[PDB]
């Protein structure tokens, strides 16, 4: 499993996106396009932009 941390807040605009807060711990499901699929601490999933998260 790969953990990434949110660099910035992101507000979901589409049902398949995920709301994230800066410094939130996330798990990376798919990094093969510019929408990255992530999972949060409560096992909700969705897409966030690649530039919003990084491996610490």
Numbering used by the authors: 2 to 57
Sentences from the paper on this structure:
Nck proteins are composed of three N-terminal SH3 domains and a single C-terminal SH2 domain (reviewed in Ref. 3). Nck recruitment is required for complete T cell activation, and its inhibition dampens TCR signaling by reducing Zap70 phosphorylation. The objective of the present study was to initiate development of an inhibitor of the Nck/TCR interaction, specifically by blocking binding of the first SH3 domain in Nck (Nck1-SH3.1) to the PRS in the CD3ϵ subunit of the TCR.
The apo-form of Nck1-SH3.1 (residues 4–59) was crystallized at a pH of 6.5 in triclinic space group P1 with two molecules in the asymmetric unit. The diffraction data were phased by molecular replacement using the SH3 domain of human hematopoietic cell kinase (HCK). When superimposed on the NMR structure of the Nck1-SH3.1 domain, the root mean square deviation (RMSD) is 1.2 Å for the core SH3 residues 5–57. For comparison, the two protomers of Nck1-SH3.1 in the asymmetric unit superpose with RMSD of 0.24 Å.
